[PDB]
Amino acid sequence: IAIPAHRGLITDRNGEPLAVSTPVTTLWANPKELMTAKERWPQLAAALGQDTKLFADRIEQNAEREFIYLVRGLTPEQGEGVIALKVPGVYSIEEFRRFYPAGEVVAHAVGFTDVDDRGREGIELAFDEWLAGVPTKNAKPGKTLALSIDLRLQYLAHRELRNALLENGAKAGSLVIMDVKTGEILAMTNQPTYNPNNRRNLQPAAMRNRAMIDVFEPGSTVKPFSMSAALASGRWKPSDIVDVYPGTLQIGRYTIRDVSRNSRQLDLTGILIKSSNVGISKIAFDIGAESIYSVMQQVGLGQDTGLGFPGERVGNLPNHRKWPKAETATLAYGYGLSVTAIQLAHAYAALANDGKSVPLSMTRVDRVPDGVQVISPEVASTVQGMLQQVVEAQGGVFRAQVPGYHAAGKSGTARKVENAYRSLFAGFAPATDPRIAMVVVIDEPSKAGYFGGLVSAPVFSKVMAGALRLMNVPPDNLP
């Protein structure tokens, strides 16, 4: 008997158990031996919770066999209660059942194991070799894995994303919380979600890890990165003015149209506040799409994350030797590419980390890796101040303001090309010394093609406020 291996424990970043192999008890029987004690069967059938006739049927039907299971997955205490009856032919072997104490809250991140206790999805699959040991014959146990997830932030993001969808009647949603300095994924919740313990049913739409496999056109949420390429070109400064009247711009056959068409002159910050597609397009025409593509590619948009998660969609950041005006514009205002919510959070973390990009991590980061300075500290600081103005200035996204803090971020309207409406908000806080980056995705707020609009911003406000408190970040907006 080459003994099996004990599956390693998965915890959150602070040791809270997320996937523990708990001991269970399995009762089996030798039918030829049980046949000599038929008068014990009604008592034994009752202790197993089974019908007297149906239980007697199983034994007599498999009388020539010498091994059948009576019941698997019992608790140690319940298994000893039946063994205490000392019915001839009833034997016991203690097994291991994978249990997930957090249940549906970390379902998509943790994943699950199959019948042969092998990693099938989530972390259970990405670290299956690490969590499963090797099978007298000596058997070594599996190693412990501590995730980057903060279970406190995870519970917060889960219930706030759930409460927001029920309030608006949305079909689905995603929320990613990220530590901008360490690259750690502090929280990643998806709706709808399933219970990995209660897998009698198996709804396929609930097992969808949308934060990593759903791709969408980020829209205005990448305009800060176009602005970053403008500021790094040496041709634009924050006081420069762009004329966006009358809210439309004709480029040959196509016509760029702004969502709000009530502006004429805007400075660079007002282009972000008003979220003008015309304004960001005129900037892109001057600096060229290559400088914008380079920034988006360096912050990870459309790039492999390196997390090794199953089903991870990379997205698509198109590249061209020669960029026409149409492809330049659509890239500049976020409809010329497709990303995941994880990639968008990673890119915002770089901007918040004063322009230094750090590799994503699903496990706890002890030694912080050397970053890549993608955006200069001076340009990153300037864009940070602009995104703070997007949230705090006149006509800005006021629903995203965090009480007692200076928050910064950008709202968008994603499109999955038949097309699908998603509401986006990506941000970080505190604006004056960023610690946390967050991306909120809401699939069709009211309905598919509705008029809800800014629905993700209030979720950003409530979750960021809680995450800053849970991490004891000092308030920097004390009036």
Residue numbers in the entry: 56 to 190, 210 to 491, 500 to 561
Reported in the publication:
Subclass B3 PBP (known as PBP3 in Escherichia coli and encoded by the ftsI gene) is active during cell division and localizes to a multiprotein complex termed the divisome, where it functions in PG synthesis in concert with the division-specific glycosyltransferase FtsW. PBP3 consists of three major domains: the N-terminal transmembrane helix anchors the protein in the cell membrane, while the C-terminal transpeptidase domain (TPd) is the catalytic module of PBP3 and mediates cross-linking of PG chains by ω-peptide linkages between d-Ala and meso-diaminopimelic acid (m-DAP) residues on opposing peptide chains. AiCuris previously reported on the development of a novel monobactam (AIC499), which shows remarkable inhibitory activity against PBPs of Gram-negative bacteria, and good antibacterial activity, even against clinical isolates harboring several β-lactamase classes.
For E. coli PBP3, a soluble version of the P. aeruginosa orthologue was produced lacking the N-terminal transmembrane helix (PaPBP3ΔTM). Remarkably, three distinct crystal forms were identified for PaPBP3ΔTM, featuring different unit cells and lattice contacts but all belonging to space group C 1 2 1. Diffraction quality was generally superior when compared to EcPBP3ΔTM crystals, with moderate anisotropy and usable resolutions of 2.2 Å (crystal form 1), 1.8 Å (crystal form 2), and 1.9 Å (crystal form 3; for details refer to Table 1). In fact, the head subdomain (T77-R152) appears to largely bend as a rigid body, leading to slightly different orientations. In fact, the final models for crystal forms 2 and 3 lack several side chains in this region as well as small portions of the extreme N-terminus because of missing electron density, whereas in crystal form 1, larger parts of the backbone could not be traced. In the TPd, the largest differences between the three apo-PaPBP3ΔTM structures concern the β3-β4 and β5-α11 regions, both of which show indications of high flexibility. In crystal forms 1 and 2, eight and six residues are not resolved, respectively, while in crystal form 3 nine residues are missing.
